[PDB]
Enzyme design. Structure first.
Site, PDB file in Angstrom:
ATOM      1  N   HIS A  34       0.783  -1.236   0.000  1.00 57.88           N
ATOM      2  CA  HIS A  34       0.000   0.000   0.000  1.00 57.88           C
ATOM      3  C   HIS A  34       0.811   1.281   0.000  1.00 57.88           C
ATOM      4  O   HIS A  34       0.263   2.367   0.218  1.00 57.88           O
ATOM      5  CB  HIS A  34      -0.972   0.035   1.178  1.00 57.88           C
ATOM      6  N   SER A 103      -3.825  -7.556  -1.641  1.00 56.25           N
ATOM      7  CA  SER A 103      -4.804  -6.665  -1.030  1.00 56.25           C
ATOM      8  C   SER A 103      -5.301  -5.578  -1.973  1.00 56.25           C
ATOM      9  O   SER A 103      -4.548  -4.738  -2.479  1.00 56.25           O
ATOM     10  CB  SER A 103      -4.265  -6.039   0.249  1.00 56.25           C
ATOM     11  N   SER A 105      -7.360  -2.269  -2.591  1.00 61.68           N
ATOM     12  CA  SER A 105      -7.834  -1.073  -1.882  1.00 61.68           C
ATOM     13  C   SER A 105      -7.927   0.091  -2.865  1.00 61.68           C
ATOM     14  O   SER A 105      -8.462   1.162  -2.485  1.00 61.68           O
ATOM     15  CB  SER A 105      -6.910  -0.697  -0.720  1.00 61.68           C
ATOM     16  N   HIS A 109      -5.907   0.609  -6.176  1.00 62.69           N
ATOM     17  CA  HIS A 109      -4.701  -0.169  -6.472  1.00 62.69           C
ATOM     18  C   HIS A 109      -4.768  -1.535  -5.838  1.00 62.69           C
ATOM     19  O   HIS A 109      -5.663  -1.822  -5.048  1.00 62.69           O
ATOM     20  CB  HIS A 109      -3.439   0.534  -5.953  1.00 62.69           C
ATOM     21  N   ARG A 117      -5.715  -9.314   4.425  1.00 62.35           N
ATOM     22  CA  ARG A 117      -6.675  -9.302   5.505  1.00 62.35           C
ATOM     23  C   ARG A 117      -7.870 -10.141   5.099  1.00 62.35           C
ATOM     24  O   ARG A 117      -8.537 -10.728   5.935  1.00 62.35           O
ATOM     25  CB  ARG A 117      -7.114  -7.879   5.821  1.00 62.35           C
ATOM     26  N   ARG A 118      -8.201 -10.125   3.818  1.00 58.24           N
ATOM     27  CA  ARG A 118      -9.327 -10.920   3.337  1.00 58.24           C
ATOM     28  C   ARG A 118      -8.745 -12.300   3.133  1.00 58.24           C
ATOM     29  O   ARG A 118      -7.606 -12.426   2.658  1.00 58.24           O
ATOM     30  CB  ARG A 118      -9.836 -10.365   1.992  1.00 58.24           C
TER      31      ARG A 118
END
Lengths: 197, 206
Positions: A34, A103, A105, A109, A117-118
């Protein structure tokens, strides 16, 4: 050379605490954890399949891949190699070990990180996008066909930033148990792929 | 940056291991300590970061204090710590935030004897938690098993170019390996309770 990464950004069958409606209803840069300064490539294909939103991206950044190449030379994990006949590949093996999750988000991106987390977000890396999409048993040739139709240096960070990142990961609780669950949920196995967990 | 001290048990006499090669009997120790060592990262001879300053065979084990001096290594660690959310969360109150010490505590949370003493993510011997601090006195005081006599005996030892031939890539290649050490966190928490240290009074992340 480039490395492909594919995996589910979400799984429609897992609730916990991105439905197919919102999703199918809703290119994107690929970054490390991120961090907008650590962009390593872009997402190449995104398919809303039966069990979830699958994506395929490619790591292009020469800078990032060089840092990873040097680092992989000093890793016992990657020195311990893969599961033959699997061809030993240092950069792919290091990446599998470090950024074993995805991830999201589509939106803003996709981030490569230690664990998503998922659940169901395991990342599989390979040198060929076909090979990658083939590790996942939930994909039909129709799915594999849809993604197949879809499929300077933007990395503004360094090895220190990646190293500061690694330490944080050491303290993610349940990381390995999570990765093993993800690995079984999505159908991939440490034996067919380069997955280290 | 500025030297950092590390102290902790290299072995605990009250811990019996299933693995014989991990056996370090008091008799064995005491001896050698009747008849200095470089401090390196994870047993890598190219990654020496300082030296052991004091080694005391106490009641519950062999305790050691060393100091991380390498400017090169401490710079790498300084930069890296800037991009860590773990260290950005800072220590427990009322401790003063110290990035380099906090990163080191997070990464090299354990000690290992082997010729030299190695800083690593978790030690194979239990009780090997590493406590880092800016003052050797402060360090030795995190450990409740130490008597003033013990503290006085070590103090005398410590009282009285750059050896680091590696780089950030080598440390990064190392971090990955640690991600795959099974039971690491449970181990560190056991070590932390065995030896008496508490996050509430040290910069310990486990």
């Amino acid at each position: 050379a480039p490395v492909y990464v594919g995996g589910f950004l979400a799984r429609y069958d897992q609730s916990p605490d991105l439905p197919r409606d919102v999703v199918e209803h809703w290119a994107l840069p690929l970054n490390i954890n991120h961090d907008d300064t650590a962009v390593v490539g872009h997402v190449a294909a995104m398919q809303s399949v039966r069990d979830g939103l699958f994506c395929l991206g490619c790591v292009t950044s020469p800078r990032f891949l060089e840092i990873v190449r040097r680092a992989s030379e000093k890793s016992e994990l990657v020195s311990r190699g893969p599961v033959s006949p699997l061809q030993p590949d240092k950069v792919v093996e290091f990446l599998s070990g470090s950024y074993a999750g995805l991830s999201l988000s589509p939106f803003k991106h996709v981030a490569l990180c230690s664990v998503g987390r998922r659940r169901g977000t395991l990342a599989v890396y390979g040198r060929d996008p076909e090979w990658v999409t083939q590790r996942f048993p939930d994909l039909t040739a129709a799915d594999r066909d849809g993604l197949r139709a879809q499929w300077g240096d933007p990395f503004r960070s360094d090895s220190y930033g990646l190293l500061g990142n690694s330490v944080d990961a050491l303290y993610i609780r349940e990381r390995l148990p999570k990765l093993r669950y993800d690995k079984q949920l999505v159908g991939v196995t440490e034996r067919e792929s380069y997955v280290k967990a």
